[PDB]
Amino acid sequence: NEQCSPQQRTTRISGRDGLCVDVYGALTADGSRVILYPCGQQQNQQWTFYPDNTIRSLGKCLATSALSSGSNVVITNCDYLRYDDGWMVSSSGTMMNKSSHLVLTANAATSRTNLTGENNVFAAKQAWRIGNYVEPIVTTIIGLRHMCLEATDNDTNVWLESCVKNKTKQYWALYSDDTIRVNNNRNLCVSSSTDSSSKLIVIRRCDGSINQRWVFTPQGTISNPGYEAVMDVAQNDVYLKKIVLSSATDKGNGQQWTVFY
């Protein structure tokens, strides 16, 4: 089966706020930097993946420009990296330089932002959807007692309510930076607690933080990888109207969720 071994694939890469990984001004010179830009069809936003662990646009290779955190990611001549073991991408969407462990990061949301190689802290600024379909995915999130997650208290809290197909606030936009955004206000993100005394999960203004990165795992959890925790229904009681971040456990069903799109 030769389809077990695909030779290459050209795709896009989206991430923070649904912007795309883009070679600034389609410049081809070695060390020409990479930025967030609004997604389109241009060749400078087209990234070809190969078995050699290279990722390429404009015939040149995506790469970090320094061992230390904080320097730009760039395209450079692929012949420079012939002795390098290249890039690695986790299930979560963390794109990591295999050698240095630095990760593709966007230190601001704003278009034309320089992408840098930073230390992985599992922040939403560091999550990426490799794929041509860069749009947010609109859906309901269904958990304990077949109930839906709903944005409440003027989009500040979140908890389970009975699923109603019409209900506007039960819809969520799954962005390419692993954020889970309020559907009709996509500046707001689902957020683990910022107050140390609370485990309550809430809704806040999207900031690219660790609190705001969520991974829908195949085992049916919504994981916050940075905090090594998962979304849970407080006391397995939907009527408490509290969703909290907990250590993965198989005690109840409160940590199990389904995406319905």
Partner: protein
């Protein structure tokens, strides 16, 4: 045998049955990067079937043989009778429903084959609590005119729901709202692409989670979403097991 009966058909019971089915199917499964379990393969025929019992509104029961390599129905038993698809593994009749009157259904267990012979498609076939109950009856008596369409119901409500949480969920909404549905493009996309998505997931191992080819999955707005990589929650948090495809 794992079981689902009409007398106790509730969202919770359905969800348990599907859950126990998945895990029963994934005993000794292999695992990739993606963490989606891959069904067993080159299994000895003696061990390749999982039996499941379905009991209808009358107190009457069928036992269905699921091929554990591909989560399809191979055959079923009603009382002292049993019925095999043409494309059941050729030795299957010597392993399952041994002590019964064995009949060959003159069609394959595939949707295409079932739809051609029954003259009726999935899109026009209702799914729901009472259809499932009736599909069990028609199989029990083996009303030839209703066998195909019955399989369309039951394959989808049992096996395809086990494959895809979306589909499971689609059946749960139906049980709770007490409303029948016919499968839209969303459901069909999944059913259509299970084997292809299995292949691309396993092939993507060597392209950093990127597929060799794209797969179009519809949402409930009929907008096609292209899945060309493992980084889509509508795949990763949906499809519960894969067909063995690649080493």
């Amino acid at each position: 045998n794992l079981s689902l009966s009409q007398s106790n058909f509730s969202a919770d019971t359905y969800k348990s049955f599907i859950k126990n089915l998945r895990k029963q199917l994934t005993i000794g499964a292999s695992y990739g990067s993606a963490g989606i379990p891959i069904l067993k393969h080159s299994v000895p025929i003696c061990e390749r079937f999982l039996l499941v019992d379905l009991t209808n509104g009358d107190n009457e029961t069928i036992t269905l043989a699921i091929n554990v390599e591909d989560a399809g129905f191979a055959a079923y038993r009603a009382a002292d009778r049993s019925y095999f698809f043409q494309n059941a593994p050729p030795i299957a009749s010597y392993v399952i429903f041994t002590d019964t009157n064995q009949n060959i259904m003159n069609f394959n267990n595939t949707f295409e084959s079932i739809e051609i012979v029954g003259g009726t498609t999935r899109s026009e076939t209702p799914l729901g609590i009472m259809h499932f109950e009736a599909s069990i009856f028609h199989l029990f008596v083996h009303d030839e005119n209703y066998v195909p369409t019955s399989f369309l119901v039951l394959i989808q409500m049992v096996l395809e729901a086990a494959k895809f949480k979306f589909i499971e969920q689609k059946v749960i909404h139906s049980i709770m709202d007490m409303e029948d549905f016919t499968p839209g493009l969303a459901m069909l996309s999944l059913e259509e692409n299970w084997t292809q998505l299995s292949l691309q997931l396993q092939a993507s191992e060597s392209l950093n989670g990127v597929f060799g080819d794209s797969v179009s999955l519809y949402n409930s707005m009929d907008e096609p979403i292209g899945v060309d990589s493992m980084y889509y929650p509508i795949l990763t948090a949906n499809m519960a097991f894969q067909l063995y495809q690649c080493p």
